[PDB]
Chains A and B, each alone.
Chain A
């Protein structure tokens, strides 16, 4: 059962994937911090 449940959960998530879904400000802040760390080391 749960294999089908995971399958359909991914389906119903990807269908609402007009981008990163329900991420929040932490999404952007952490990504920017990591990117700027990459810049500092690159």
Chain B
């Protein structure tokens, strides 16, 4: 009560001399302003109703200002005040665990964001000298993604697939799995995840935040929600806000991971924003600019060399393809901007094979680089064996052919996984080892899942010393291989 009265005092009621303009016509989400003589381009003007807008067009007689809210709160004749700073957002480790909207205004309750530094959403990507090749591994905790199509730190993978094929699930598992690194001793393996929700139902993001709080995963995650209802100029801006909150870490020596979900619903917001500016539509009514929109956003997921801090910013854009057409306009626009891709088939998903990665088409163009040596040993064989199995699965003779079929089916059953169940790297190594070396070719395929579960519960309970040996020495030595072979054989015996 008196707390509220202290809330009264200490508020800045000082008045300042500020330049101003008068709105002429608001409609279609683009206000026209008159005046603002000394207004910079891409500046952030502020309307009288607390709204904000980005000074977009500097025409000789007026300023076209895109409103960052609902244009029903803007009259004609209102007053627009320039805040004298290119569109900024608050950055810092004060945002971690906070659900901020596209402009850093906490939509969380939980007080305001106590940030002390601001970045520009319209910054430029690092050049060619600062960057260095991708070296460190980004552990997704998903067997299929971590073995076959690995990811690095600084890479910008893509997750592409249809409605409800488990793209958000892969994103959330990647976010959750980082919990173990974000508790250890060295600040060199800590990953500070970010999650941009663009044009998504608000209830979905609420439940996602609840899930991330169940798994203790909000200590480092920032959720930047520009949900379905929010005006188009906010869904267009949210990715850039998130990318700035990640660039802060990248430029201060830390490691970040940003998940845009989806980028197929930012390009739709941008197409709205453009067609309402009368810009000439192109292919599918998208403006010709709809490439630069994503290229400039995804070119910031860099990996700065050691003379520039050494930080990094992984990116996991999530595209959504109607009827699984990988050759549409936006899917190809983004497939030519990213360093890899993870195709989530909708018929593998409907077969219960989840996560539905289509390993035939998925690829990672840093791939074997930035992969733990142990996983490399175990999973190169899996890659070759799966390749051979795929070559022949179009009909269902000899010993080798049936051997390929059986081993491939076993491996497929082995790569399935459950939600919110990431696995440490050593656990994946152990499972895929028991799968590829051939200690499962007799067990029925239908049982391969049960085995997996049981096997884990054994290895985690009893032989944690071996798993720690694998983790510390990121490689399967000969003695470690022999001990692991003994463990697998003994466990399989009792089955």
Contacts and interface: CB of A to CB of B under 8 A. Distances in A.
B132 to A, nearest CB: 53
Contact of B1 (A2, A7, A14): A14
Contact of B13 (A3, A7, A10, A14): A3
A6 interface: yes
Tell me the interface secondary structure of chain A in the complex.
helix
A3 B1 contact: no
B5 A2 contact: no
Contacts of A6: 5, 8
Nearest to A2: B13
Interface in B1-29: 1, 4-5, 8-9, 11, 13
Contacts of B4: 10
Interface in A1-19: 2-3, 6-7, 10, 14
A2 B8 CA distance: 10
A3 B9 contact: yes
Interface residues of A, number: 6
A7 B9 CA distance: 9
Tell me the interface secondary structure of chain B in the complex.
loop
Contacts of B13: 2-3
A3 B7 CA distance: 11
Contacts of B9: 3, 7
A16 to B, nearest CB: 13
A40 B25 CA distance: 50
A35 to B, nearest CB: 21
A34 to B, nearest CB: 17
B118 to A, nearest CB: 28
A6 B4 CA distance: 11
Interface in B418-452: none
Contacts of B5: 6-7, 10
A3 B4 CA distance: 13
Nearest to B10: A3
A6 B10 CA distance: 13
Interface string B372-401: 000000000000000000000000000000
A10 B4 CA distance: 9
Contacts of A2: 13
B10 to A, nearest CB: 9
Contacts of B11: 3
A6 to B, nearest CB: 5
A7 B5 CA distance: 7
A6 B8 CA distance: 8
A6 B9 CA distance: 9
Contacts of A7: 5, 8-9
B273 to A, nearest CB: 40
Nearest to B5: A10
Contacts of A10: 4-5, 8
A2 B1 CA distance: 19
A13 to B, nearest CB: 10
Contacts of B1: 14
A7 B10 CA distance: 12
B494 to A, nearest CB: 47
B85 to A, nearest CB: 28
A31 B297 CA distance: 48
B97 to A, nearest CB: 25
Nearest to A5: B8
Interface in B271-327: none
A25 B4 CA distance: 25
Contacts of A3: 8-9, 11, 13
A8 B9 CA distance: 12
A41 to B, nearest CB: 15
A14 B4 CA distance: 12
Nearest to A10: B5
6 A-B pairs closest in CB distance: A6-B8, A10-B5, A3-B9, A3-B8, A7-B5, A3-B13
7 contacts: A3-B13, A6-B5, A6-B8, A7-B5, A10-B5, A10-B8, A14-B1
Interface of A: 2-3, 6-7, 10, 14
Given A7-B5, A10-B5, 12 more contacts: A2-B13, A3-B8, A3-B9, A3-B11, A3-B13, A6-B5, A6-B8, A7-B8, A7-B9, A10-B4, A10-B8, A14-B1
